[PDB]
Write a protein that binds this DNA or RNA. Structure first.
Ligand SMILES: Nc1nc2c(ncn2[C@@H]2O[C@H](COP(=O)(O)OP(=O)(O)NP(=O)(O)O)[C@@H](O)[C@H]2O)c(=O)[nH]1
Ligand SMILES: Nc1nc2c(ncn2[C@@H]2O[C@H](COP(=O)(O)OP(=O)(O)NP(=O)(O)O)[C@@H](O)[C@H]2O)c(=O)[nH]1
Ligand SMILES: Nc1nc2c(ncn2[C@@H]2O[C@H](COP(=O)(O)OP(=O)(O)OP(=O)(O)O)[C@@H](O)[C@H]2O)c(=O)[nH]1
Ligand SMILES: [Mg+2]
Ligand SMILES: [Mg+2]
Ligand SMILES: [Mg+2]
Lengths: 201, 62, 441, 454, 393, 104
RNA sequence: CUAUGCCGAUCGGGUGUCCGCACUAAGUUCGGCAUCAAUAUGGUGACCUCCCGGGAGCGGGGGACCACCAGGUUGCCUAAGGAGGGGUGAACCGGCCCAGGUCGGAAACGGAGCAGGUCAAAACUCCCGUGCUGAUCAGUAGUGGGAUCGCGCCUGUGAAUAGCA
């Protein structure tokens, strides 16, 4: 159906969106509205999927997320590895929100966490990011205690350390970075992304 | 917590019994009140804290 | 012997009185109120009741280092009113004319202040700032009046003065000046664009030669002024060392100077006895620990910022504290040298125990001396020297503890002395001979 | 013109020529932040600290045109430029921009440098000669001596909507700014035949209301408490506001909520001017201790009151409370301050000095749901007082808004919008009663629905 | 024509609408005022040429003066009978501080005043009243044990009636229409104490929301004059007028400060001046009595001559004349030549004799009359002598 | 069809706006109609004077300011009665010059 | 000599509460006095000089210099001086409109001009703004000392604190 790109502000979602389409570097700014484009899989079949990019600004994430959750078949989440340390709480909260939204769907979409800005040296490894996310989400569930002033969902059985294995979702991790220098001129690093898209196709 | 304090130590030890109970209080709280203007009730009403709590001679019935 | 920081004063006045968000009316009101307060405090009444007699400050008056601030605030108020008129001139063009008049006043005030800085009484650093401020005001006035040549010359002069001043100070102090240069960077460009970009190159080429020939004498004399100002500032009021090269504006630096002079007044005073300086040593220790606490008072918020994020690096947070800690450790070392002098003057059982306790104290002190720069790890020779002193003191403590007179341990003291002899040789005359004689006996 | 850029609403740069003269690191990101939150009412003018900026919107093809010029004042040609080239660009690339899909934009190329350079040099040549001031001044002297949506068609409903927002306790200037933003959002945009103009403008206005009332990230105090406990340093929260906004009641509610969550609290008092405030807080502490015995939590005390009597300076009491909490290892300190009028300068200076000295982790402005047309002024005064009294760049401003007495109107919620307009900070808590259990959060959808249900 | 006048009026009305809305005034009242002022202007059919905006400002000032007060005289205390005043309002309105200020004000007026509190739900309420009473040195009543406001108020009012206090003030906690229990508690308190007046206090900053609360207060229980508070701040309190419309009662006092001494009686002129923002307002059988007093002026002579010429020939009454008519008409012209200041003056002869320039001006304005002026003065003096002789008898 | 002359034309103290027609230096002080009539009669006998009518701008009621002069300069056939004085200016200046001699 | 305390157990240094304090910074409030000029064009009003025409009232036209209002570009002005708003216009002499009356005339009509009305443009005066001035206060706060037998904070380390006969 459609594949959604989600992340924080200045997370690089538009850059990956244009890279997966044209393969050329294009200057970009912060997203204001969504952008939907049909992209064919590189395989011999060449099936077409609608890649939809949603702005990462916190004033518009929830509206588009709740408006486009039904049409989505697969969900792609983007995390900035270079700036992860300063924004661990923000990415954890957004991941919790998107997981809660996804669990409401009748059909469970495939879930991918793609670290970005990996071309830089300070970027962290995939397993380290996964462990940090697990540790933060262990307490983030407990922190959810407030009156909505108007249906809660739990990511674990209240007794054990939160893990992605116990979740009824297929969560994948990979390393990708396409900005320049090593990334675009030298050799593109998005082949794992297209392989995963073919696998989920 | 015990601390030694400097000052008129011979004159502090001359009584050797007890100092004045209100040793650190403002002049208007002192028993003598050091009052150039003893009353100054309207002046205290005009400026200062909104309400002062102390011994009340007004009616206090429960 | 009196100086004033014009740029710092005007910036701290602007950033806290409405110019932070771009408001000039309340800033002008504050400037007028401060002028009134200064005139009231200094009793510089020029107009009494039913009369008015404007009077100018003379050279003999400015000894209080505050009369210059009066003219500075007058110039700032005129400039603020001019900027407010510029903002309001969009609605009514007539205000522009009024604007010009205000500028005609403002530069005059600045130039008056310049003629008040010609006296040798005021410091040269204030003279440079006054010249830069006057040049900036004149350039802005000429730019407003569509006079490109005078404005560009004044702006170039101001930029040169500011960059020379920034190079004269440290990197931490100069950034503000650099910011000011940035604030003057765009307008200058626009002036060149007003030339036409065709004759502008030739004008700049001629202006370089004009500055080299006409202002060349002024350039070299101001360079000499900067050099002598830096030299006298480092020699008299400021302190420059390997650690904490940034000039500490805090008053406690003077205390260090006192400590410093005490040092050169102590060693000559006490030759061998050193007994009469023990009270002086205690007073110096009290003063230096008070200075350390005062430094820590401002250190702690920076420690909080350092703990907040890993982005912040070292070299600024612990640049002044480490010098004071080093001074305290040096004073402790001198005290321990005095204790060693007393011990060697002598030659009963609790005395070696107390000596070993003191040696443990100095071991802890040298451990801290290694740790603090070791925590910073700016340089590397300091840790080497500190560790050498630490191992030497540890070997001395071991030799004192294992002395056969000190310790009555047969068949055990000899083994320890033999084991420590190799360490002492690795670290490395009378002390060695005495230790060898004690080991033999 | 030292900077210029044309890009679509999708965040994809189409054409720019800034070069080495300027870098688009974040001069346009700031403009995007302004146009999204705290919409610009400066009539297409923005004042970035480095240089001024001007923007133009085209909702027909969701495009924007930004021109950045230095802080030095330019001539009046620039706006004319931003018009003509716009049409020219709209004339040059009709086929590419008219397509909904963004693939055509990537496929297409734009050799727009030559035409834009020609327009710029023509405008500069026109600006070189301007000597019409004398004739205009003489004329003034004589006078003194003597489908696509059009703005005019949508004016009427606009004003009526404005009136409705006025009925809903929204500030007049806030309503005008919101109407201007909505009008800018709808200029020549195509409109479907099935929908009506009123329905479209109402939907756009409610979407804008949801966006503005959905502020920046919802960072919570509870998560930050553990982060503060990582270094074993107290977490400081300060309450500020004008008189009669229920600071003490909301303070008690927050303390009760924290105790229920299982964290020890320290209540520092500074309402020295207020008569009986110390005993009021003492009664609150007694009630909380009765509800939560010390032994049930492990034998350690939970809530303690810190005060020095009436008349003492607030900053010293706050500093002593912070030191005592650090020595006793209290999780969180909550500081209550006496209400201060915004026009009273000395009280604002004292509050700013207290905030600067105590550097609290969180600052909460307690506002009123009943107040109208005055919340904006109070927020402006508080923010400017906190800003000008701190010399450091990017000073600590108000970080949280607590709206109380929400259960007394239930229809005039629009006042909250005004606050959320004047400051971009989110609303942390909403009070809905006088008991200790009336401390709930804010639901944006419900608030908007109640605002526009009539 | 008044073609551009209509556009100018519309622009000024829009500006006034913006200014009033910035002054936290209800939109419905603004629209009603706009309709009334536009109707009044159309009735006038002309605009004052003295100033373009002064006339409009004066008209809206008069309209607001009419709207602010219902016309009912404010209630005043009566000596010899104890007066009970019950304070009501919303939460945070500052009703307790208003009670303290009013008690101090009445004590300064020479009254035996006392304070009683019924606020029991709010924690730490009676302590504030105690501190405020001992600050002003005024007797107070209350207890920390009993929680029912009704019994506490009844006991306090009975004890103070025994004490023979002139003025009793009773304060109760603020409440809103949503909670009906608080309203029924207020009703029970009113039944128990039977208050003489019920004063409702509302914050000046609160606007466009307090109208419903005021209407509910008026509907459930009787109300009296209202008091506005917190006027010392930037808020102009423009919404309080709506509360007046909900109560049809005037304002007796205003609150312009935190200290107890800041308490002043309400005045309409400063309030409307603050609301407008400029406050630029400029304000500007007898014959038998005069005959008895004997005072005669040139006005009386002119009226007598007018009546004589209206009557016509004297031969008609009795039953050469043309010269008499000519003399009469020339005298009327010469007496109309001069100004009214000399005409209404009691002693015209003195003011003429002191300044011959007045005679010169009169001669300029009429015929030569080089001898007629003094003849007229002599005739006026003779008539004044006759008038005083008649008045004496 | 005689031309009209008034004493107010020959008065120096009167302003030009109030009736003065000649420079102040050449004028005289308080001229009368009879003086003008007798001085102009020495040249032409066509002048006749009346005293019961006065000039319009003469607000003051005085005998010396009362009266007017009629002088014939044209024979009503297209020829000047006296070629010496072709304009009223000549006649009035001659009268102004001759007044002081008779006043002394 | 018995016994005392517990990890800092002995011994100490700054501070803050404190002062009929000194002084500053930053604010509130209330008074006094003061508030420019050239030049470009146009307008208004005096006063003055030239003409043209007519039997008068008067009509036609061009200058002189002063004051003042709009208001072009400005400065060898400024302590500061905005083209800001308002009142009064008197006794009876600042305009403008000027009934009646009065005067010029056969008439048409005009002129002076009172009362009265009116005012971008006599003069005076007030308000705001601006400058200078005195006065005013603490629910603003900071070292400069004093004070300091406790009560609240920050920094120190020895083993040695107080009875016995
Ligand atoms: N209905 C309602 N009443 C509330 C709410 N919050 C507070 N109140 C009421 O409003 C009043 C204000 O009480 P208080 O907390 O003492 O006010 P304050 O802001 O602390 N005053 P100050 O700042 O001067 O100390 C009390 O009567 C309280 O019960 C709320 O959310 N809803
Ligand atoms: N500026 C100003 N503040 C006032 C005035 N009256 C009261 N306040 C303040 O407003 C707040 C509320 O007043 P207060 O009487 O203490 O609360 P309350 O009236 O008892 N609340 P309730 O009776 O509803 O429980 C307090 O902080 C008080 O100091 C006033 O006239 N002016
Ligand atoms: N070094 C590096 N930078 C990246 C990478 N991906 C994105 N960026 C950053 O992203 C910026 C460009 O903006 P985008 O990549 O489109 O980010 P965005 O899509 O606008 O993110 P939103 O604001 O949420 O819309 C560049 O300036 C980069 O700094 C990457 O892989 N490596
Ligand atoms: Mg994007
Ligand atoms: Mg409170
Ligand atoms: Mg109350």
């Amino acid at each position: 159906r459609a594949v959604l790109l989600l992340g924080l502000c200045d997370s690089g979602k538009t850059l990956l969106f244009v890279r997966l389409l044209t393969g050329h570097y294009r200057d970009t700014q912060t997203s204001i509205t969504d952008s939907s484009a049909t992209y064919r899989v590189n395989n011999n079949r060449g099936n077409s999927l609608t890649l939809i990019d949603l702005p990462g600004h916190e004033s518009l994430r929830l509206q588009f997320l709740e408006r486009f959750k039904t049409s989505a078949r697969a969900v792609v989440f983007v995390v900035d590895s270079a700036a992860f340390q300063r924004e661990v709480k923000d990415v954890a909260e957004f991941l919790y929100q998107v997981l809660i939204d996804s669990m409401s769907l009748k059909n469970t979409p495939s879930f991918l966490i793609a670290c970005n800005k990996q071309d830089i040296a300070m970027a962290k490894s995939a397993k380290l990011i996964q462990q940090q996310l697990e540790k933060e989400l262990n307490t983030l569930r407990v922190t959810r205690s407030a009156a909505p002033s108007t249906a809660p969902a739990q990511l674990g059985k209240k007794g054990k350390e939160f893990e992605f294995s116990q979740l009824p979702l297929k969560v994948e991790f990979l390393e990708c970075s396409a900005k320049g220098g090593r990334g675009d001129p030298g050799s593109a690093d998005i082949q794992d992304l297209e392989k995963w898209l073919a696998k989920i196709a | 917590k015990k601390k030694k304090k400097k000052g008129k130590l011979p004159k502090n030890y001359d009584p050797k019994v007890t100092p004045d109970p209100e040793r650190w209080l403002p002049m208007r709280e002192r028993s003598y009140y050091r009052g150039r203007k003893k009353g100054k009730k309207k002046d205290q009403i005009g400026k200062g804290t909104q309400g002062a709590t102390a011994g009340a001679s007004s009616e206090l019935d429960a | 012997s009196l100086s004033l920081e014009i740029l710092q004063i005007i910036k701290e006045s602007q950033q806290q009185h409405g110019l932070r968000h771009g408001d000039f009316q309340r800033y002008r009101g504050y400037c007028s109120r401060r002028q009134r307060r200064l005139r009231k405090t200094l009793n510089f009444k020029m107009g009494n009741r039913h009369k008015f007699t404007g009077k100018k400050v003379t050279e003999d008056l400015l000894t209080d280092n505050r009369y210059l601030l009066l003219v500075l605030m007058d110039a700032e108020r005129a400039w603020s009113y001019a900027m407010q008129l510029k903002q309001e001139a969009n609605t009514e063009p007539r205000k522009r004319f009024h604007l010009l008049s205000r500028l005609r006043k403002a530069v005059k005030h600045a130039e008056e202040l310049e003629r008040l800085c010609e006296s040798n009484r005021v410091d040269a650093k204030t003279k440079l700032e006054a010249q830069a401020y006057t040049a900036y005001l004149s350039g802005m006035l000429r730019f407003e009046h569509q006079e490109w040549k005078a404005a560009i010359e004044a702006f170039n002069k101001c930029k040169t003065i500011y960059e020379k001043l920034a190079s004269a100070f440290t990197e931490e102090q100069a950034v503000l000046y650099n910011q000011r240069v940035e604030e003057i960077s765009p307008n200058i460009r626009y002036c060149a664009y007003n030339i036409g970009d065709q004759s502008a190159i030739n004008e700049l080429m001629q202006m370089r030669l004009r500055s080299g020939g006409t202002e060349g004498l002024l350039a070299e004399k101001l360079e000499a002024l900067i050099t002598q100002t830096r030299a006298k500032q480092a020699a008299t009021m400021s302190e420059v060392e390997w650690r904490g090269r940034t000039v500490p504006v805090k008053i406690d630096k003077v205390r260090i100077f006192l400590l410093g002079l005490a040092d050169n007044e102590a060693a000559i005073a006490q030759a061998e006895s050193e007994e009469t300086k023990e009270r002086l040593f205690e007073s110096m220790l009290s003063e230096c620990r008070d200075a350390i606490q005062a430094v820590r008072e401002e250190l702690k918020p920076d420690q909080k910022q350092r703990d907040y994020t890993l982005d912040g690096e070292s070299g600024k947070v612990s640049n002044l504290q480490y010098l004071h800690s080093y001074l305290t450790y040096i004073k402790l070392s001198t005290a321990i040298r005095r204790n060693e002098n007393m011990a060697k003057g002598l030659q009963r059982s609790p005395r070696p125990q107390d000596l070993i306790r003191l040696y443990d104290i100095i071991l802890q002190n040298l451990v801290e001396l290694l740790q603090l720069p070791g925590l910073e790890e700016d340089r590397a020779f300091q840790k080497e020297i500190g560790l050498k002193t630490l191992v030497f003191k540890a070997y001395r403590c071991f030799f004192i503890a294992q002395s056969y007179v000190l310790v009555k341990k047969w068949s055990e003291a000899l083994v320890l002395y033999d084991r420590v002899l190799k360490y002492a040789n690795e670290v490395n005359x009378x002390x060695x001979x005495x230790x060898x004689x004690x080991x033999x006996x | 013109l030292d900077f210029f850029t044309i890009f679509s609403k999708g965040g994809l740069v189409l054409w720019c020529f800034q070069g080495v003269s300027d870098s688009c690191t974040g001069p346009v990101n700031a403009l995007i932040r302004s146009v999204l939150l705290q919409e610009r009412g400066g009539n297409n003018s923005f004042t970035h600290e480095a240089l001024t900026l001007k923007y133009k919107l085209d909702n027909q093809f969701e495009l924007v045109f930004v021109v950045g010029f230095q802080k030095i004042l330019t001539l009046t040609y620039v706006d004319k430029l931003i018009d003509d080239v716009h049409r020219l660009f709209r004339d040059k690339y009709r086929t590419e921009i008219q397509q909904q899909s963004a693939l055509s934009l990537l496929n297409g190329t734009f050799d727009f440098q030559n035409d834009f350079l020609r327009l710029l040099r023509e405008a500069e040549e026109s600006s070189k000669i301007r000597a019409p001031t004398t004739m205009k001044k003489f004329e003034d002297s004589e006078k003194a001596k003597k489908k696509s949506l059009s703005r005019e068609d949508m004016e009427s409903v606009l004003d009526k909507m404005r009136d409705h927002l006025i009925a809903k306790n929204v500030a007049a200037d806030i309503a005008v700014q919101l109407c201007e933003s909505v009008a800018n959002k709808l200029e020549g945009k195509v409109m479907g035949t099935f929908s009506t103009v009123t329905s479209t403008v109402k939907q756009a206005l409610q979407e804008s209301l949801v966006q503005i009332l959905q502020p920046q990230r919802r960072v919570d105090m509870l998560r930050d408490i553990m982060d503060a406990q990582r270094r074993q340093r107290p977490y400081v929260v300060t309450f500020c506001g004008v008189n009669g906004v229920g600071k003490s009641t909301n303070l008690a509610k927050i303390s009760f909520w924290l105790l229920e969550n299982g964290f020890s609290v320290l209540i520092a008092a500074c309402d020295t001017f207020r008569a009986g405030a110390v005993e009021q807080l003492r009664t609150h502490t007694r009630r909380l201790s009765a509800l939560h015995p010390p032994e049930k939590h492990g034998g350690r005390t939970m809530v303690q009151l810190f005060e020095k009597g009436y008349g003492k300076d607030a900053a010293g009491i706050a500093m002593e409370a912070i030191a005592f909490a650090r020595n006793q290892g209290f999780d969180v300190v909550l500081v209550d301050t006496a209400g201060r009028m915004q026009d009273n300068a000395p009280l604002m200076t004292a509050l700013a000095k207290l905030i600067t000295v105590n550097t609290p982790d969180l600052v909460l402005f307690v506002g009123e749901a009943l107040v109208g047309n005055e919340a904006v002024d109070q927020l402006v005064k508080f923010n400017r007082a906190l800003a000008d009294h701190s010399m450091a760049q990017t000073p600590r401003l108000i970080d949280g808004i607590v709206l109380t007495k929400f259960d007394t109107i239930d229809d005039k919620v629009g006042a909250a919008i005004s606050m959320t307009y004047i400051t971009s900070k989110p609303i942390v808590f909403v009070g809905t009663g006088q008991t200790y259990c009336d401390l709930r959060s804010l639901n944006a959808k419900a608030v908007v629905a109640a605002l526009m249900k009539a | 024509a008044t073609i551009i006048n209509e556009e100018v009026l519309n622009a000024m009305l829009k500006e006034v609408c913006t200014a009033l809305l910035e002054a936290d005034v209800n939109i419905k009242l603004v629209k009603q005022l706009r309709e009334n002022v536009k109707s009044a202007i159309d009735l006038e059919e002309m605009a004052s040429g003295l100033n373009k905006r002064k006339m409009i400002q004066h008209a809206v000032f008069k309209e607001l003066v009419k709207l602010v007060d219902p016309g009912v005289k404010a209630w005043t205390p009566t000596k010899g009978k104890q007066n009970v005043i019950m304070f009501v309002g919303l939460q945070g309105s500052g009703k307790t501080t208003t009670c303290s200020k009013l008690a101090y004000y009445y004590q300064r007026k020479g009254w035996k005043t006392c304070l009683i509190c019924a606020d029991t739900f709010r924690a730490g309420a009676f302590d504030q009243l105690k501190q405020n009473a001992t600050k002003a040195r005024i007797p107070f009543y209350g207890s920390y044990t009993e929680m029912d406001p009704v019994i506490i108020a009844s006991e306090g009012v009975e004890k103070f009636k025994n004490e023979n206090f002139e003025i009793i003030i009773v304060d109760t906690s603020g409440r809103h229409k949503q909670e009906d229990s608080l309203f029924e508690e207020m009703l029970q308190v009113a039944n128990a104490i039977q208050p003489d007046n019920i004063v409702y206090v509302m914050d000046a900053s609160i606007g466009q929301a307090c109208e419903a609360q005021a209407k509910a207060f008026k509907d459930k229980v009787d109300v009296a004059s209202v008091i506005v508070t917190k006027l010392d701040g930037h808020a102009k309190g423009g919404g309080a007028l709506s509360a007046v419309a909900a109560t049809k009662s005037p304002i007796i006092f205003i609150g312009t400060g935190e200290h107890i001494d800041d308490f002043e009686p309400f005045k309409t002129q400063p309030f409307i001046s603050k609301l407008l923002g400029m406050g630029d307002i400029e304000g500007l059988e007898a014959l038998i009595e005069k005959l008895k007093h004997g005072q005669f002026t040139l006005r009386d002579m002119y009226e007598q001559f007018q009546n004589i010429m209206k009557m016509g020939p004297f031969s008609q009454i009795l039953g050469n004349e043309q010269e008499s008519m000519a003399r009469l008409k020339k005298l009327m012209t010469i007496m109309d030549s001069m100004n009214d200041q000399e005409l209404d003056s009691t002693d015209g002869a003195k003011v003429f004799s002191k300044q011959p320039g007045r005679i010169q001006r009169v001669a300029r304005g009429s015929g030569v009359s080089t001898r007629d002026v003094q003849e007229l003065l002599t005739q006026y003096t003779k008539f004044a002598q006759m008038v005083k002789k008649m008045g004496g008898i | 069809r005689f031309i009209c002359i008034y004493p107010a034309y020959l008065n120096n103290k009167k302003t030009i706006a109030e009736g003065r027609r000649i420079p102040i230096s050449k004028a005289v002080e308080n001229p009368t109609a009879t003086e003008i009539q007798d001085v102009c009669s020495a040249v032409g006998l066509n002048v006749f004077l009346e005293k019961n009518k006065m000039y319009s701008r003469e607000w003051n009621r005085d005998v010396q300011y009362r009266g007017r002069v009629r002088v014939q300069l044209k024979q009503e056939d297209g020829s000047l009665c006296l070629v010496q004085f072709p304009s009223r200016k000549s006649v009035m200046l001659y009268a102004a010059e001759m007044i002081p001699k008779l006043k002394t």
